[PDB]
Amino acid sequence: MTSTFDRVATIIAETCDIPRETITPESHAIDDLGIDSLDFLDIAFAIDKAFGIKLPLEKWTQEVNDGKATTEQYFVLKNLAARIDELVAAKGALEHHHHHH
Questions:
Q1: Which CATH number characterizes residue 61's domain?
Q2: Coiled-coil ranges per the record (predicted)?
Q3: φ, ψ (nearest 5 deg) of residue 84
Q4: Residue 54 — φ and ψ, nearest 5°?
Q5: How many structural domains is the chain composed of?
């Protein structure tokens, strides 16, 4: 029993050495865990290859710093785990389509 969050949290411990105990689902990877966006690239590429998906990290980070999206929307570990899972669902091409197509 290990969720998408728990996989990510293991990968955070592997990459940037952040204690699993001090990693909550409602934690912000950058603000709360104190991980830089570059260190988060190493985490996100390790996630990327693990789940066999593709995170548009550059897109997510440009939206965040353009004020299109709030930081927490992508960088809170439950929202992040939901984004990854959403792209694992997109990896399987769904059957009810992604948005509408």
A1: 1.10.1200.10
A2: none
A3: -65, -50
A4: -135, 110
A5: 1
The three-class DSSP label of residue 76 is: strand
How many helices (H) and strands (E) the chain has is answered by 5, 0
For the stretch 30-38, contacts whose Cβ atoms lie closer than 8 Å and that sit 24 or more positions apart, written own/partner, are 30/71, 30/75, 31/71, 31/75, 37/61
Technique used to solve these coordinates:
NMR
CB burial string 30-65: b at 16+ within 10 A, e below: bebbebeeebbbbbbebbbeebebebebeebbebbe
